[PDB]
DNA sequence: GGGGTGTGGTAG
DNA sequence: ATCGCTACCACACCCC
């Protein structure tokens, strides 16, 4: 299906993984707003809480071998190098089991990339994936996380990962035996609940130390590490961009900054709370600085005291970033449309309207091939965005496309040069039961 | 003090 | 072959 045949987009989204996720993480949110429309659902100043934040284990390739063909009824989910993935050459690895990972491999490699890691001999074995089997696992997943009645408030993170607080009376001695004793109960009845997927946990009394607490504890494993416990070998067991918020940027701002820190260790040794700021902003520089000390910032609480309003969605957009290859400007108008009306279904289904949208688009690098190493990438390319206030809310397809194709004139790229497509509304209004307006 | 725009970065 | 999405904080830099 080529980007011009109408069935594109659903072509498209039916096979993309990370379309996958981002829906299906979109969908555990309204879900939770629905099911907590009438409840407080909410921690308190006067909660001390413990946080199980709970992931199952290299998730795609679990599944996808639980699930697996005949033609794979020989592998060994213990013995091979297992990815999940389309393609054979410049296709990303979505996961990769624990035996590929101790070669190195990691999720978002290309296979190309992940082959070149294996001895003679070693064969990656590669999976397609069962996007259908990863729903109902993730279902039976958070079932089990409802049904164990141990948690206060069940947060999702992703279609496999969840942050659940339980709230500790001050009435109780809350002791790690009772907390091994939920980690492993928890574990247990995910492995009954999914038939044999396995769940790690990191249990803590902040955000980001169960969330290195879950590092930790991979594969197949948890660790309970509270503030109390913290020492030089816990940090010394962490990668810098183990911390939440530490991407591959940030990252080689504090190599640079710090003289290439090896752990978390290192770089709470070494760093001064200015200096981090000037290495990676204000804001990241105070996150990272109060989570070298185990402790969440302000924005990380939010979600604690005020789920309903972080989970609640404030734009809604969709992007296009492989498979552009239009001829003419009267193709590129036609897909703005189709990605138009698929938007506007959305934002119909939520029951809201759109009083500002964007359009953003990849174009070529001038000295970039017109074929990229990737099969239908984007290739090396350069980002223009230009948005839009439509000044009385909308949900009108004539008015938003009518816009979106103005927008994309305005930013002068040749439909051959094109290689990407975001559409966004990126301000929502509710619609109430009074619309009388002059 | 309040508003605005386009872009960087991260996560899963 | 191969399916490189998408929400949202933070930021720089502009206005008054
Ligand atoms: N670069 C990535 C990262 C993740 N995913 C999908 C596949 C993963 O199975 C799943 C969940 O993401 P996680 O980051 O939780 O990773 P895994 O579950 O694969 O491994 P881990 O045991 O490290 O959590 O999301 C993907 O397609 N591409
Ligand atoms: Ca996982
Ligand atoms: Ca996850
Ligand atoms: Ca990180």
Redesign the pocket.
């Given at each position: 299906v080529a980007c011009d045949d109408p069935d594109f987009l659903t072509?498209?989204?039916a096979?993309?993984?990370?379309?996958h996720?981002?829906?299906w993480?979109?969908n555990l949110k309204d879900k939770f707003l629905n099911e907590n429309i009438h409840k407080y659902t909410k921690i308190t100043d006067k909660d001390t809480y413990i946080i199980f934040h709970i992931?199952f284990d290299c998730f795609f390739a679990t599944v996808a071998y639980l699930c697996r063909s005949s033609s794979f009824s020989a592998c060994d989910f213990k013995r091979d190098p297992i990815v999940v993935?389309?393609?054979?050459?410049?296709?990303?690895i979505?996961s990769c089991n624990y035996v590929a990972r101790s070669y190195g491999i990691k999720n978002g490699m290309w296979?190309?990339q992940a082959e070149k890691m294996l001895p003679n001999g070693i064969k990656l074995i590669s999976l397609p994936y069962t996007f259908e089997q990863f729903q109902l696992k993730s279902e039976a997943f958070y079932s089990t996380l409802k049904r164990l009645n141990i948690f206060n408030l069940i947060l999702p993170?992703?279609?496999?990962?969840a942050v659940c607080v339980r709230i500790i009376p001050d009435n109780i001695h809350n002791t790690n035996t009772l907390n091994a004793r939920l980690c492993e109960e928890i574990r247990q009845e995910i492995f009954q609940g999914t038939n044999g997927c396995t769940v790690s946990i990191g249990c803590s009394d902040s955000l980001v130390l169960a969330a290195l607490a879950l590092k930790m504890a991979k594969p197949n494993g948890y660790n309970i590490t509270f503030k109390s416990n913290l020492s030089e070998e816990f940090w010394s067991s962490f990668k810098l961009?183990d911390?939440?918020?530490?991407?591959?940027?940030?990252?080689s701002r504090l190599e640079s900054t710090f003289d290439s820190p090896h752990s978390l260790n290192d770089l709470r040794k070494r760093y001064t709370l200015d200096a981090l700021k000037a290495s990676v902003?204000?804001?990241?520089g105070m996150k990272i600085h109060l989570a070298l000390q185990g402790q969440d910032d302000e924005?990380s609480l939010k979600i604690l005291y005020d789920p309903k309003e972080?989970?609640?969605?404030?734009?809604?957009?969709?992007?296009?970033?492989?498979?552009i290859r239009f001829k003419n400007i009267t193709q590129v108008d036609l897909f703005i449309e189709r990605g138009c009306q698929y938007l506007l279904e959305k934002l119909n289904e939520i029951n809201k309207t759109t009083s500002?949208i964007?359009l953003?688009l990849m174009r070529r690098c001038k000295d970039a091939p017109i074929e990229?190493?990737?099969?239908?990438?984007?290739?090396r390319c350069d980002?223009?965005?230009?948005?839009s206030?439509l000044g009385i809310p909308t949900n009108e397809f004539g008015i938003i496309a009518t816009e979106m194709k103005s927008l994309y004139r305005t930013l002068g790229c040749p439909p051959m040069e094109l290689r990407?497509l975001?559409l966004?509304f990126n301000k929502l209004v509710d619609v109430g039961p009074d619309n009388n307006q002059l």
């Open positions: 072509s498209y989204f096979h993309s993984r990370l379309h996720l981002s829906a993480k979109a992931d993935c389309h393609g054979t050459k410049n296709s990303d979505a296979v190309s993170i992703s279609i496999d990962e961009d911390l939440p918020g530490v991407g591959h940027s940030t990252l902003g204000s804001k990241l924005e972080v989970l609640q969605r404030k734009s809604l957009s969709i992007d296009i970033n492989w498979g500002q964007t953003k990229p190493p990737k099969y239908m990438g984007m290739g980002s223009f965005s230009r948005s206030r990407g975001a966004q």
